[PDB]
Amino acid sequence: VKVPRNFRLLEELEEGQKGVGDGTVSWGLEDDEDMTLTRWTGMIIGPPRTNYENRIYSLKVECGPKYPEAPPSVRFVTKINMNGINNSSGMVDARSIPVLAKWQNSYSIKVVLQELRRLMMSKENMKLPQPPEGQTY
């Protein structure tokens, strides 16, 4: 048990439940019995005025023993065509996502999801053709 890690992830769990940010991303435990607070799920509402519009993206986020000193691992469940996301596995490439590539220990699951949503509206992603609704990895 690392007290600082566990305190932090309980704070994030509470923030997840209270709602924070602008409402367009959410996060929670993958299984509410995981007292290790390692496996999370995330939601991103697909941004209007992009090809992600009218879709809700499901993600998995893993916060290992070094979190939040070390960045989490992220994978899309919902199929997505987006830079930095392996089109075959759904794994997020940390080096293509600035907040993962340049992780700071003040960052959070929230910040990661917010960053991914921002990148969905970038010119290089926003008009990518997308797989049919409902497909997953």
From Swiss-Prot:
<dbReference type="InterPro" id="IPR016135">
    <property type="entry name" value="UBQ-conjugating_enzyme/RWD"/>
</dbReference>
<dbReference type="GO" id="GO:2000781">
    <property type="term" value="P:positive regulation of double-strand break repair"/>
</dbReference>
<dbReference type="InterPro" id="IPR000608">
    <property type="entry name" value="UBQ-conjugat_E2_core"/>
</dbReference>
<dbReference type="GO" id="GO:0000729">
    <property type="term" value="P:DNA double-strand break processing"/>
</dbReference>
<comment type="function">
    <text>Has no ubiquitin ligase activity on its own. The UBE2V2/UBE2N heterodimer catalyzes the synthesis of non-canonical poly-ubiquitin chains that are linked through 'Lys-63'. This type of poly-ubiquitination does not lead to protein degradation by the proteasome. Mediates transcriptional activation of target genes. Plays a role in the control of progress through the cell cycle and differentiation. Plays a role in the error-free DNA repair pathway and contributes to the survival of cells after DNA damage.</text>
</comment>
<dbReference type="GO" id="GO:0005737">
    <property type="term" value="C:cytoplasm"/>
</dbReference>
<dbReference type="GO" id="GO:0031371">
    <property type="term" value="C:ubiquitin conjugating enzyme complex"/>
</dbReference>
<protein>
    <recommendedName>
        <fullName>Ubiquitin-conjugating enzyme E2 variant 2</fullName>
    </recommendedName>
</protein>
<comment type="similarity">
    <text>Belongs to the ubiquitin-conjugating enzyme family.</text>
</comment>
<dbReference type="GO" id="GO:0070534">
    <property type="term" value="P:protein K63-linked ubiquitination"/>
</dbReference>
<dbReference type="GO" id="GO:0000209">
    <property type="term" value="P:protein polyubiquitination"/>
</dbReference>
<dbReference type="Pfam" id="PF00179">
    <property type="entry name" value="UQ_con"/>
</dbReference>
<dbReference type="GO" id="GO:0006282">
    <property type="term" value="P:regulation of DNA repair"/>
</dbReference>
<feature type="domain" description="UBC core">
    <location>
        <begin position="4"/>
        <end position="137"/>
    </location>
</feature>
<dbReference type="GO" id="GO:0006301">
    <property type="term" value="P:postreplication repair"/>
</dbReference>
<keyword id="KW-0007">Acetylation</keyword>
<dbReference type="GO" id="GO:0016567">
    <property type="term" value="P:protein ubiquitination"/>
</dbReference>
<dbReference type="GO" id="GO:0042275">
    <property type="term" value="P:error-free postreplication DNA repair"/>
</dbReference>
<dbReference type="GO" id="GO:0005634">
    <property type="term" value="C:nucleus"/>
</dbReference>
<dbReference type="GO" id="GO:0070062">
    <property type="term" value="C:extracellular exosome"/>
</dbReference>
<dbReference type="GO" id="GO:0031372">
    <property type="term" value="C:UBC13-MMS2 complex"/>
</dbReference>
<dbReference type="GO" id="GO:1902523">
    <property type="term" value="P:positive regulation of protein K63-linked ubiquitination"/>
</dbReference>
<comment type="subunit">
    <text>Heterodimer with UBE2N. Binds CHFR.</text>
</comment>
<keyword id="KW-0833">Ubl conjugation pathway</keyword>
<dbReference type="GO" id="GO:0005654">
    <property type="term" value="C:nucleoplasm"/>
</dbReference>
